[PDB]
Amino acid sequence: SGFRKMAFPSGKVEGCMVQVTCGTTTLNGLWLDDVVYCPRHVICTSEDMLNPNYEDLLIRKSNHNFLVQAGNVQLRVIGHSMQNCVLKLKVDTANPKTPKYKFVRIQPGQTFSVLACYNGSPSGVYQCAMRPNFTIKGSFLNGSCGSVGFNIDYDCVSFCYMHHMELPTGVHAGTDLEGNFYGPFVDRQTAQAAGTDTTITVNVLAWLYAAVINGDRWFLNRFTTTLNDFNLVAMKYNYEPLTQDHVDILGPLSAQTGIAVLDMCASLKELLQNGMNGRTILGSALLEDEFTPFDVVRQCS
Amino acid sequence: SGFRKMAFPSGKVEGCMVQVTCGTTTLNGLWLDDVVYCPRHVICTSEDMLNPNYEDLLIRKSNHNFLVQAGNVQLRVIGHSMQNCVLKLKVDTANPKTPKYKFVRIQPGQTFSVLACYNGSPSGVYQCAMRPNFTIKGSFLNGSCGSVGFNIDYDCVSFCYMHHMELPTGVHAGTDLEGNFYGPFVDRQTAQAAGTDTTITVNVLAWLYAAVINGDRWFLNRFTTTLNDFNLVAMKYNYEPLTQDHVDILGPLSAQTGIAVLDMCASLKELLQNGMNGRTILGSALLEDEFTPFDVVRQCS
Ligand SMILES: O=C(N[C@@H]1CN(C(=O)c2cccn3cncc23)CC[C@H]1c1ccccc1)c1ccc[nH]1
Ligand SMILES: O=C(N[C@@H]1CN(C(=O)c2cccn3cncc23)CC[C@H]1c1ccccc1)c1ccc[nH]1
């Protein structure tokens, strides 16, 4: 028993982290096989940053402008290329610690582990979610660009996030590992801001199932709701719409606990309308939305 | 910016986890050099468990009763010994992945990362604290005994916890790596329960400093308190006494933010007496006590 915010074991990703240096600018890169992947803004000066043309900036670089350090070993760059917002540096040595891996672009609502890194060196691991507004609420300082987010599927690391920037509200924006931003953001200094976020309803429902599995049952009731009447309440409280696909995904947890999805929806409706009244669920005094249905199943059973 | 519950990168500990089997009983062990460390209750049957004499139970075992598996490789046990509540199995192979390491027995209030394991295989990583009552609020299922808790100091892993049991309330009890329980607990099935816990005051104050560093400042006030008058309030709300040593430890954070420790104590006093009034701090609607002063410094700067 017990329920914690739990990251994946980070070892397999630790063995891929490198430092990439271009000039005075230094950040982290991901070394898989003979390629190192990093944010393309490593090639920029402060003057460039207002509106860079990256195609011009990279045209003016040679392989010898890129210093890659793996540990204490300097890796020699033998080719360079840009794919979207990521730079790919080909190196002369394949990483002997390369795990089995995939690159995946995730949907909003999906969770992942972040290995926060500075100068090629892992500092900490944490879980977060891709928010509906395509930011993440991470924990990142100066120097952390190029840190990655991942899930593990047995022995396969599925990389899903590379960190690029911090927005004015203190949340974070970045790309998939093929260099496409999540959201409307661009890799320049401009006026960009996060849009209005929503709560991830299917995840709240999953975590209420986690709570039941762990013995918190106070919020349950004898009532049910229709999906439409639930969705009407959800809209009012700035929650995402619940779909039949979500209802179907919550199937396993419904079966384990004995509580129908739309019966759990009536609990959530009551919690939204009334509050908790000073009580807690799983240690929380607010409704938590960064555990997926899969995360609950993973951890609880 | 941002502030998350953050574990240490777990790689160095992942390379030490093994499965230990004794009969039908299987659990996790920690392989460092040529020794594997695990909970001594691996030698018990269900019948024994009411009140085992472990000295008799181990006297009846040979080396060949212990199967250690590292990955797919079976490691051959060449000696066995008991130290307190841990079994030490000497194996014929030194672990080539052994990190630099220490064993440390921590004080209540200190935090650590847990690598939760099943059958020798890491499943997830999370942070927790040693509570004042000498339990931890972990996340552990059947099969997780022998999972360890640790801190990292540069490249040195300081192991501080080995998991042994779950108490009736769903919290967890275990030992240091020399096999001494934290708390009054014993490794048998008996009527034992967690005592009344308290909130770790110095850690709450650290996290309020984290909040200020990250821009949440709403809870601050123009007031101050004496240490004695603060301690009087702390007692009433079931908080641990704040010492001058704690005040001194909070020095760095006081200096960075400009807020005196006893001025921050007046904020906490006001929060205890009045509540948050529907506001949040760092995403939380309750006061968080599982970040130490060191953890804040680590993460924020
Ligand atoms: O995020 C911005 N700038 C970053 C700042 N930075 C950091 O490593 C960093 C600093 C401070 C907190 N952090 C948290 N994560 C990373 C950082 C170096 C890269 C730079 C950048 C360059 C080209 C394109 C995109 C971002 C920025 C500017 C205006 C709004 N945002
Ligand atoms: O924790 C108890 N028994 C454990 C149960 N167990 C597990 O791996 C485990 C099961 C279920 C949830 N978990 C969470 N962490 C581990 C587990 C095998 C070892 C056993 C044990 C044997 C000798 C001495 C101490 C504990 C127990 C009994 C009465 C109160 N507590």
Numbering used by the authors:
A (entry chain A), B (entry chain A): 1 to 301
Anything the authors wrote about it?
Structure-guided scaffold morphing provided a novel trisubstituted piperidine core. In order to evaluate if it was possible to introduce P3 substituents on the piperidine core that could cause induced-fit effects in the S3 pocket, we applied FEP calculations, as implemented in the FEP+ package (see Experimental Section for details). In FEP+ calculations, compound 11 with the P3 alkyl moiety and compound 12 with the P3 aromatic moiety were predicted to improve the SARS-CoV-2 Mpro inhibition relative to compound 10 by inducing an induced-fit in the Gln189 side chain along with the formation of hydrogen bonds with the backbone of Glu166 (FEP+ ΔΔG = −2.9 kcal/mol (10 → 11), −3.6 kcal/mol (10 → 12), Figure C–E). As expected, both compounds exhibited over 10-fold improvement in the SARS-CoV-2 Mpro inhibition compared to compound 10 as well as moderate MERS Mpro inhibition (11 MERS Mpro IC50 = 4200 nM, 12 MERS Mpro IC50 = 4500 nM). Comparing the binding mode of compound 12 in the crystal structure with the one in the FEP+ calculation, a representative conformation of the side chain of Gln189 in the FEP+ calculation did not correspond to the one in the crystal structure. This is probably because the side chain of Gln189 has large fluctuations and various conformations, as indicated from B-factors in the crystal structure and the FEP+ simulation. Although the P3 acetamide moiety of compound 10 had a binding mode similar to that of compounds 11 and 12, the SARS-CoV-2 Mpro inhibition of compound 10 was weaker. It is likely that potency is significantly boosted by the addition of P3 substitutes that form a hydrogen bond with the backbone carbonyl oxygen of Glu166.
The main protease (Mpro) is essential for viral replication. The primary function is to cleave two large viral polypeptides into functional nonstructural proteins. , Although Mpro is a highly conserved protease among various coronaviruses, there are no human proteases with a similar cleavage specificity. Therefore, Mpro is an attractive target for antiviral drug development for COVID-19 treatment. Here, we report the discovery of highly potent noncovalent inhibitors of the severe acute respiratory syndrome coronavirus 2 (SARS-CoV-2) main protease (Mpro) with pan-coronavirus (pan-CoV) Mpro inhibition through computer-aided drug design.
